[PDB]
Design a protein around this nucleic acid. Structure first.
Ligand SMILES: [Mg+2]
Ligand SMILES: [Mg+2]
Ligand SMILES: [Mg+2]
Ligand SMILES: [Mg+2]
Ligand SMILES: [Mg+2]
Ligand SMILES: [Mg+2]
Ligand SMILES: [Mg+2]
Ligand SMILES: [Mg+2]
Ligand SMILES: [Mg+2]
Ligand SMILES: [Mg+2]
Ligand SMILES: [Mg+2]
Ligand SMILES: [Mg+2]
Ligand SMILES: [Mg+2]
Ligand SMILES: [Mg+2]
Ligand SMILES: [Mg+2]
Ligand SMILES: [Mg+2]
Ligand SMILES: [Mg+2]
Ligand SMILES: [Mg+2]
Ligand SMILES: [Mg+2]
Ligand SMILES: [Mg+2]
Ligand SMILES: [Mg+2]
Ligand SMILES: [Mg+2]
Ligand SMILES: [Mg+2]
Ligand SMILES: [Mg+2]
Ligand SMILES: [Mg+2]
Ligand SMILES: [Mg+2]
Ligand SMILES: [Mg+2]
Ligand SMILES: [Mg+2]
Ligand SMILES: [Mg+2]
Ligand SMILES: [Mg+2]
Ligand SMILES: [Mg+2]
Ligand SMILES: [Mg+2]
Ligand SMILES: [Mg+2]
Ligand SMILES: [Mg+2]
Ligand SMILES: [Mg+2]
Ligand SMILES: [Mg+2]
Ligand SMILES: [Mg+2]
Ligand SMILES: [Mg+2]
Ligand SMILES: [Mg+2]
Ligand SMILES: [Mg+2]
Ligand SMILES: [Mg+2]
Ligand SMILES: [Mg+2]
Ligand SMILES: [Mg+2]
Ligand SMILES: [Mg+2]
Ligand SMILES: [Mg+2]
Ligand SMILES: [Mg+2]
Ligand SMILES: [Mg+2]
Ligand SMILES: [Mg+2]
Ligand SMILES: [Mg+2]
Ligand SMILES: [Mg+2]
Ligand SMILES: [Mg+2]
Ligand SMILES: [Mg+2]
Ligand SMILES: [Mg+2]
Ligand SMILES: [Mg+2]
Ligand SMILES: [Mg+2]
Ligand SMILES: [Mg+2]
Ligand SMILES: [Mg+2]
Ligand SMILES: [Mg+2]
Ligand SMILES: [Mg+2]
Ligand SMILES: [Mg+2]
Ligand SMILES: [Mg+2]
Ligand SMILES: [Mg+2]
Ligand SMILES: [Mg+2]
Ligand SMILES: [Mg+2]
Ligand SMILES: [Mg+2]
Ligand SMILES: [Mg+2]
Ligand SMILES: [Mg+2]
Ligand SMILES: [Mg+2]
Ligand SMILES: [Mg+2]
Ligand SMILES: [Mg+2]
Ligand SMILES: [Mg+2]
Ligand SMILES: [Mg+2]
Ligand SMILES: [Mg+2]
Ligand SMILES: [Mg+2]
Ligand SMILES: [Mg+2]
Ligand SMILES: [Mg+2]
Ligand SMILES: [Mg+2]
Ligand SMILES: [Mg+2]
Ligand SMILES: [Mg+2]
Ligand SMILES: [Mg+2]
Ligand SMILES: [Mg+2]
Ligand SMILES: [Mg+2]
Ligand SMILES: [Mg+2]
Ligand SMILES: [Mg+2]
Ligand SMILES: [Mg+2]
Ligand SMILES: [Mg+2]
Ligand SMILES: [Mg+2]
Ligand SMILES: [Mg+2]
Ligand SMILES: [Mg+2]
Ligand SMILES: [Mg+2]
Ligand SMILES: [Mg+2]
Ligand SMILES: [Mg+2]
Ligand SMILES: [Mg+2]
Ligand SMILES: [Mg+2]
Ligand SMILES: [Mg+2]
Ligand SMILES: [Mg+2]
Ligand SMILES: [Mg+2]
Ligand SMILES: [Mg+2]
Ligand SMILES: [Mg+2]
Ligand SMILES: [Mg+2]
Ligand SMILES: [Mg+2]
Ligand SMILES: [Mg+2]
Ligand SMILES: [Mg+2]
Ligand SMILES: [Mg+2]
Ligand SMILES: [Mg+2]
Ligand SMILES: [Mg+2]
Ligand SMILES: [Mg+2]
Ligand SMILES: [Mg+2]
Ligand SMILES: [Mg+2]
Ligand SMILES: [Mg+2]
Ligand SMILES: [Mg+2]
Ligand SMILES: [Mg+2]
Ligand SMILES: [Mg+2]
Ligand SMILES: [Mg+2]
Ligand SMILES: [Mg+2]
Ligand SMILES: [Mg+2]
Ligand SMILES: [Mg+2]
Ligand SMILES: [Mg+2]
Ligand SMILES: [Mg+2]
Ligand SMILES: [Mg+2]
Ligand SMILES: [Mg+2]
Ligand SMILES: [Mg+2]
Ligand SMILES: [Mg+2]
Ligand SMILES: [Mg+2]
Ligand SMILES: [Mg+2]
Ligand SMILES: [Mg+2]
Ligand SMILES: [Mg+2]
Ligand SMILES: [Mg+2]
Ligand SMILES: [Mg+2]
Ligand SMILES: [Mg+2]
Ligand SMILES: [Mg+2]
Ligand SMILES: [Mg+2]
Ligand SMILES: [Mg+2]
Ligand SMILES: [Mg+2]
Ligand SMILES: [Mg+2]
Ligand SMILES: [Mg+2]
Ligand SMILES: [Mg+2]
Ligand SMILES: [Mg+2]
Ligand SMILES: [Mg+2]
Ligand SMILES: [Mg+2]
Ligand SMILES: [Mg+2]
Ligand SMILES: [Mg+2]
Ligand SMILES: [Mg+2]
Ligand SMILES: [Mg+2]
Ligand SMILES: [Mg+2]
Ligand SMILES: [Mg+2]
Ligand SMILES: [Mg+2]
Ligand SMILES: [Mg+2]
Ligand SMILES: [Mg+2]
Ligand SMILES: [Mg+2]
Ligand SMILES: [Mg+2]
Ligand SMILES: [Mg+2]
Ligand SMILES: [Mg+2]
Ligand SMILES: [Mg+2]
Ligand SMILES: [Mg+2]
Ligand SMILES: [Mg+2]
Ligand SMILES: [Mg+2]
Ligand SMILES: [Mg+2]
Ligand SMILES: [Mg+2]
Ligand SMILES: [Mg+2]
Ligand SMILES: [Mg+2]
Ligand SMILES: [Mg+2]
Ligand SMILES: [Mg+2]
Ligand SMILES: [Mg+2]
Ligand SMILES: [Mg+2]
Ligand SMILES: [Mg+2]
Ligand SMILES: [Mg+2]
Ligand SMILES: [Mg+2]
Ligand SMILES: [Mg+2]
Ligand SMILES: [Mg+2]
Ligand SMILES: [Mg+2]
Ligand SMILES: [Mg+2]
Ligand SMILES: [Mg+2]
Ligand SMILES: [Mg+2]
Ligand SMILES: [Mg+2]
Ligand SMILES: [Mg+2]
Ligand SMILES: [Mg+2]
Ligand SMILES: [Mg+2]
Ligand SMILES: [Mg+2]
Ligand SMILES: [Mg+2]
Ligand SMILES: [Mg+2]
Ligand SMILES: [Mg+2]
Ligand SMILES: [Mg+2]
Ligand SMILES: [Mg+2]
Ligand SMILES: [Zn+2]
Lengths: 59, 53, 83, 154, 110, 141
RNA sequence: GUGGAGCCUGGGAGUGAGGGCGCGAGCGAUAACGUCCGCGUCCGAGCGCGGGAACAACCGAGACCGCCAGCUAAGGCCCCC
RNA sequence: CGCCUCCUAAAAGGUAACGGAGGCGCCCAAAGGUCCCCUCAGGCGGGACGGAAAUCCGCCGGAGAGCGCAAGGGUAGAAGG
RNA sequence: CGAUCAACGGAUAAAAGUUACCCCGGGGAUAACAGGCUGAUCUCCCCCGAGCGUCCACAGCGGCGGGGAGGUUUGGCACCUCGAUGUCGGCUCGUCGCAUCCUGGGGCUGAAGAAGGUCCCAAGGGUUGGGCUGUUCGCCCAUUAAAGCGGCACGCGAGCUG
RNA sequence: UCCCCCGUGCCCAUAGCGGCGUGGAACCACCCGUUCCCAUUCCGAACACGGAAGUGAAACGCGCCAGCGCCGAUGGUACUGGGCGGGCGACCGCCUGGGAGAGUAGGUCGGUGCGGGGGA
């Protein structure tokens, strides 16, 4: 499957490692949506910013 | 070092070059030091005597 | 405006930090001469292909891979495994 | 003795959830078994306040078993002064170490004793600045072992 | 609580093991003497020799020298050449010393 | 009043007051006890005030147990000085007391007498307190 | 993991008075818009924008330009509004 | 006011204040190299002078002794004698 | 090999003071006034009831301890002001707070009356003239219903004094 | 292969301390001696050599016993990375992931590698 990830809450005011996680996922703007592979590596970064993000399992 | 604990040179008894610096306590060991030591000039071990530094 | 007299401290001193500790961890590739451990006393003991300097410093004798080993009352050992 | 108390089984139900709904989380165990249980707090409180760790409590399990237990451990919540957890020790034929109350005919309310479960007493009589006795000299009603050191001061 | 006997045995052996050579260990009883060459890395014995196995009797020292020769004979045959002599709790003297002499005589290197 | 007979170190850093008491949370000796509801540094003079209150209520009767000891040095700079120039002088001793701690216990006195005594004692303390009675819960610990 | 990532060589700098807040300690008085460090953050340089009556650093959010279009965030929905 | 040790220091390293505590500015010709051998303090019991404590004997005693000097680390399977 | 170059990365081989006779360049990066933050100390109010009060804890008192309020004291801190915020007291001129000195209204009293003590309500008005000291304050004299205590940049020097 | 003994390792007290019991053909120890090698700050105690009458008393090996020591869950709790709230504060609470220490049940009077000697 794949993880569809949506930035819904600004990284401003949050630790830099959390900002870097967004960048690893390729999330640059609010409300932006990205579909990534459900690998353990990608999953770790999604879960790091779980408080900033909305995730839906797709296909 | 101190007044009692002095610095000193070791002179090769054969060719007379000083080859080593070291120290001793001249109250504990008032005799001039004599030690076998490799002498770089003579290229062999030689008795070395204490000499004033 | 009254400025009442103050005393002082006899304590201000402390010494430079010595950066002690393990410098190479298990599974790390090291070259002969590499320092593995900086320590005070034999907190860690030398094992296979590991030497100890005058100040208890552990280092590698051969090119190899570092391995640690806990041996209870015998103590803790750092080895180097040839590659 | 003796007292009876309803008990139930649990698995993955959260301890905080159980306690919030008036239930006391617990475990019952011995050499042969170990089970995650819970009892009703207000009911347990009624029994334990008389049973304590001195007298037998029979757990009527939902599966019909009526198991003989001693309370071995009660973890309190230091802040609120309320029990958080109970340890029910399942009795069987083998001898058990336990505390048995003392009646003076006092540094020790009770005494530690290795007694067979069949033979569990409910009393031990002690005949009565700063004179005192040392457990060694005690009554000892048959099937009972001093589980301390006779040096111990009562 | 350790005995001076054990401490001595631990002390000379520990020093020996560090060199990493095969360990020619020697046991000396009131009647007999035993020798086994040991790989401490594998914890395995490669070759052995003893007065008891060779059924020798006589002067204990002369017997020691012989079991030494015996050990070396089997030793070189297996390709073994170098070794570290482990006197353990024993002084380097007499029976133990004679055995070492026999092993050297036989062609062992140490 | 109470203080350490001798010490390894004269001054201690202030530190923290997080959490419930480590222990001392159950009745150990007497029949009735006073338990703390809030964290504080309880002073030696506070402890002695509470004790002597209890002592007077009993007309020297009964037994009083004090289950906290002031071993923490309390330091204060002299009046009207400036910051710096080293740590202030030790001026007293306190006992760190966290919620749930049994500070005092009494025994050998009537329930009415213990309750009132422990109430008067509570009034000498800079924290909210509770009066408790020995329980099976206590004796089980 | 392709990012105004990273590494190497060299040209140009500026900076070397910080500050508020959260958490962890020391000093202080379990004082200070107090002081000294640590991890983080924001203001600094975002005194641009919404909310908080007003208000650098609290909450929301990173302003390329235009629109008399739409959805939301904190916060709000009795009138001022 | 330089240097050493411990803590502060937030379980890698590093980390401040006129924060909490100490020490160094020497020493050793054996207190250095190597080989061989040896094992402590303390406790009870026993023993002329002889004591709390001199030296002698026995039992127990894994390290609480010792390692020139502060502190820490290390250490009798010795670095101690 | 000669450094307490110990201010220990060590300005010269070689060095102490005073300035109210002072000067310039700077700083509110840093003190003194005032404000601010804080409230240790200060002023005031409470909680507890050991004791006092011949008897009687609470008329009047309140051991040891506990909790607060205020921001008039001394301070802590160094945040606007050092291209200037004139710094004590007095005089004049007010104005406000109330934790009330007097006058008005009360409860309790260990209130017979009269006169007092204590607490509650009350800020409308009032709250003297002198001797000493720069003094604020204080003590004193003679009175008085009383001779209140604090804020206003320790109110007020583009209003005076000095 | 299985049992015993002798060496020698490994795990590092579940192996230890104590209380019992057991073993001498073999092996090992003590033992018999101190001429010889070697040895004692004195001592053949130790180290060492030459032995083989005796005993398993000591030591060692092997069994038993849970008094001590040592090990030690499950359950629950403390604390906490990350995400959120509350309190004037001292401090408190919720979510998700991690999760002790103490104590309770209980367990242990060792396990195993290589070589040698003996026995079935
Ligand atoms: Mg945000
Ligand atoms: Mg934000
Ligand atoms: Mg946020
Ligand atoms: Mg966050
Ligand atoms: Mg990170
Ligand atoms: Mg955006
Ligand atoms: Mg978008
Ligand atoms: Mg992470
Ligand atoms: Mg030299
Ligand atoms: Mg010398
Ligand atoms: Mg030489
Ligand atoms: Mg030359
Ligand atoms: Mg000389
Ligand atoms: Mg001032
Ligand atoms: Mg002033
Ligand atoms: Mg000083
Ligand atoms: Mg340093
Ligand atoms: Mg340090
Ligand atoms: Mg390390
Ligand atoms: Mg070396
Ligand atoms: Mg491994
Ligand atoms: Mg362990
Ligand atoms: Mg290895
Ligand atoms: Mg029923
Ligand atoms: Mg209770
Ligand atoms: Mg209850
Ligand atoms: Mg028990
Ligand atoms: Mg022969
Ligand atoms: Mg022989
Ligand atoms: Mg050997
Ligand atoms: Mg502090
Ligand atoms: Mg205090
Ligand atoms: Mg303090
Ligand atoms: Mg200070
Ligand atoms: Mg202080
Ligand atoms: Mg406490
Ligand atoms: Mg109170
Ligand atoms: Mg009650
Ligand atoms: Mg690129
Ligand atoms: Mg960039
Ligand atoms: Mg860049
Ligand atoms: Mg340029
Ligand atoms: Mg600059
Ligand atoms: Mg600078
Ligand atoms: Mg700076
Ligand atoms: Mg910064
Ligand atoms: Mg800073
Ligand atoms: Mg700074
Ligand atoms: Mg802050
Ligand atoms: Mg917070
Ligand atoms: Mg600190
Ligand atoms: Mg600041
Ligand atoms: Mg602050
Ligand atoms: Mg602070
Ligand atoms: Mg910051
Ligand atoms: Mg700037
Ligand atoms: Mg911003
Ligand atoms: Mg920014
Ligand atoms: Mg702004
Ligand atoms: Mg503005
Ligand atoms: Mg700005
Ligand atoms: Mg705004
Ligand atoms: Mg606004
Ligand atoms: Mg604002
Ligand atoms: Mg802004
Ligand atoms: Mg601000
Ligand atoms: Mg928020
Ligand atoms: Mg952004
Ligand atoms: Mg932009
Ligand atoms: Mg944009
Ligand atoms: Mg809409
Ligand atoms: Mg909304
Ligand atoms: Mg309006
Ligand atoms: Mg409006
Ligand atoms: Mg409207
Ligand atoms: Mg660290
Ligand atoms: Mg480093
Ligand atoms: Mg000094
Ligand atoms: Mg030395
Ligand atoms: Mg020597
Ligand atoms: Mg004696
Ligand atoms: Mg004599
Ligand atoms: Mg020691
Ligand atoms: Mg000293
Ligand atoms: Mg000097
Ligand atoms: Mg300098
Ligand atoms: Mg100079
Ligand atoms: Mg310097
Ligand atoms: Mg330096
Ligand atoms: Mg010069
Ligand atoms: Mg000169
Ligand atoms: Mg000069
Ligand atoms: Mg001059
Ligand atoms: Mg002048
Ligand atoms: Mg003049
Ligand atoms: Mg002039
Ligand atoms: Mg003049
Ligand atoms: Mg001039
Ligand atoms: Mg001039
Ligand atoms: Mg001038
Ligand atoms: Mg000027
Ligand atoms: Mg100027
Ligand atoms: Mg300033
Ligand atoms: Mg400056
Ligand atoms: Mg100033
Ligand atoms: Mg002035
Ligand atoms: Mg000022
Ligand atoms: Mg100023
Ligand atoms: Mg002013
Ligand atoms: Mg000021
Ligand atoms: Mg101003
Ligand atoms: Mg205040
Ligand atoms: Mg206040
Ligand atoms: Mg105050
Ligand atoms: Mg009040
Ligand atoms: Mg009365
Ligand atoms: Mg009376
Ligand atoms: Mg008073
Ligand atoms: Mg107070
Ligand atoms: Mg207050
Ligand atoms: Mg107060
Ligand atoms: Mg003010
Ligand atoms: Mg002030
Ligand atoms: Mg500052
Ligand atoms: Mg100015
Ligand atoms: Mg101007
Ligand atoms: Mg101007
Ligand atoms: Mg001007
Ligand atoms: Mg002007
Ligand atoms: Mg001025
Ligand atoms: Mg006025
Ligand atoms: Mg009023
Ligand atoms: Mg009136
Ligand atoms: Mg009136
Ligand atoms: Mg009258
Ligand atoms: Mg009247
Ligand atoms: Mg009245
Ligand atoms: Mg009025
Ligand atoms: Mg007025
Ligand atoms: Mg006149
Ligand atoms: Mg006048
Ligand atoms: Mg006057
Ligand atoms: Mg004034
Ligand atoms: Mg005056
Ligand atoms: Mg009147
Ligand atoms: Mg007047
Ligand atoms: Mg003022
Ligand atoms: Mg004025
Ligand atoms: Mg004025
Ligand atoms: Mg003027
Ligand atoms: Mg004026
Ligand atoms: Mg003017
Ligand atoms: Mg003006
Ligand atoms: Mg004048
Ligand atoms: Mg004039
Ligand atoms: Mg064996
Ligand atoms: Mg092995
Ligand atoms: Mg036996
Ligand atoms: Mg037997
Ligand atoms: Mg035996
Ligand atoms: Mg035999
Ligand atoms: Mg026989
Ligand atoms: Mg002879
Ligand atoms: Mg035996
Ligand atoms: Mg056991
Ligand atoms: Mg026993
Ligand atoms: Mg445990
Ligand atoms: Mg658990
Ligand atoms: Mg958590
Ligand atoms: Mg958190
Ligand atoms: Mg959690
Ligand atoms: Mg969890
Ligand atoms: Mg878990
Ligand atoms: Mg555990
Ligand atoms: Mg406990
Ligand atoms: Mg349990
Ligand atoms: Mg068993
Ligand atoms: Mg065992
Ligand atoms: Mg074994
Ligand atoms: Mg067995
Ligand atoms: Mg074995
Ligand atoms: Mg075998
Ligand atoms: Mg066989
Ligand atoms: Mg066979
Ligand atoms: Zn020469």
């Amino acid at each position: 499957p794949r993880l569809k990830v949506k930035l819904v809450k600004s990284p401003i005011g949050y630790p830099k490692d959390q900002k870097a996680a967004l960048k690893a996922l390729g999330l640059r703007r609010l409300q932006q949506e990205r579909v990534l592979e459900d690998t353990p590596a990608i999953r770790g970064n999604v879960e790091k910013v779980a408080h900033l993000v909305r995730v839906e399992v797709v296909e | 070092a101190s007044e009692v604990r002095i610095k000193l040179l070791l002179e090769c008894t054969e060719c007379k070059r000083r080859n080593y610096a070291t120290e001793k306590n001249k109250r504990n060991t008032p005799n001039k030091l004599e030690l076998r030591k490799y002498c770089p000039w003579c290229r062999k071990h030689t008795v070395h005597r204490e000499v004033k530094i | 405006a009254h400025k009442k007299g103050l005393g002082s401290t006899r304590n201000g001193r402390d010494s430079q930090a010595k950066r002690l500790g393990v410098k190479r961890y298990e599974g790390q590739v090291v070259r002969a001469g590499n320092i593995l451990v900086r320590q005070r006393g034999t907190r860690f003991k030398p094992g296979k292909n590991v030497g100890m300097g005058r100040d208890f410093t552990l280092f590698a004798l051969v090119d190899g891979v570092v391995e640690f080993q806990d041996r209870g009352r015998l103590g803790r050992y750092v080895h180097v495994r040839p590659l | 003795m003796e007292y009876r108390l309803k008990a139930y089984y649990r698995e993955g139900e959260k301890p905080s959830a159980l306690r919030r709904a008036g239930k006391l989380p617990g475990v019952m165990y011995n050499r042969h078994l170990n089970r995650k249980v819970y009892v009703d707090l207000v009911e347990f409180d009624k029994v334990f306040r008389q049973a304590s760790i001195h007298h037998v409590i029979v757990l009527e399990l939902p599966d019909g078993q009526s198991l003989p237990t001693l309370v071995r451990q009660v973890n309190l919540d230091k802040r609120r002064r309320r029990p958080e957890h109970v340890d029910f020790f399942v009795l069987s034929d083998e001898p058990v170490e336990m505390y048995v109350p003392l009646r003076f005919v006092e540094i020790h309310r009770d005494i530690l004793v290795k007694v067979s479960p069949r033979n569990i007493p409910e009393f031990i009589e002690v005949d009565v600045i700063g004179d005192s006795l040392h457990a060694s000299d005690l009554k000892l009603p048959p099937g009972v072992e001093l589980a301390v050191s006779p040096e111990e001061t009562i | 609580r350790l005995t001076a006997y054990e401490r001595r045995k631990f002390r000379v052996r520990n020093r020996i093991k560090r060199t990493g050579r095969l360990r020619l260990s020697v046991f000396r009883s009131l009647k007999h003497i035993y020798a086994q060459i040991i790989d401490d890395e594998k914890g395995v014995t490669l070759v052995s020799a003893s007065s008891l196995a060779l059924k020798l009797k006589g002067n204990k020292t002369e017997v020691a020298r012989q079991v030494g020769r015996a050990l070396a004979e089997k030793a070189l045959a297996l390709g073994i050449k170098q070794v570290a002599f482990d006197r353990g709790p024993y002084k380097y003297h007499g029976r133990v010393k004679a055995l070492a002499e026999g092993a050297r005589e036989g062609g062992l290197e140490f | 009043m109470l203080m350490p007979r001798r010490m390894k170190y004269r001054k201690q850093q202030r530190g923290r007051l997080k959490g419930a008491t480590k222990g001392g949370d159950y009745v150990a000796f007497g029949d009735y006890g006073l338990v703390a509801l809030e964290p504080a540094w309880i002073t030696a003079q506070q402890i002695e005030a509470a004790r002597v209150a209890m002592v007077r209520h009993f007309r020297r009767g009964g037994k009083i147990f004090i289950r906290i000891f002031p071993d923490k040095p309390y330091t204060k700079k002299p009046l009207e000085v400036r910051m710096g120039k080293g740590k202030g002088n030790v001026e007293g001793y306190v006992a760190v007391v966290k919620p749930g701690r049994v500070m005092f216990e009494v025994a050998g006195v009537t329930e009415e007498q213990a309750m009132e005594a422990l109430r008067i004692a509570g009034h000498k303390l800079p924290i909210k307190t509770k009066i408790v009675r020995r329980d099976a819960y206590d004796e089980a610990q």
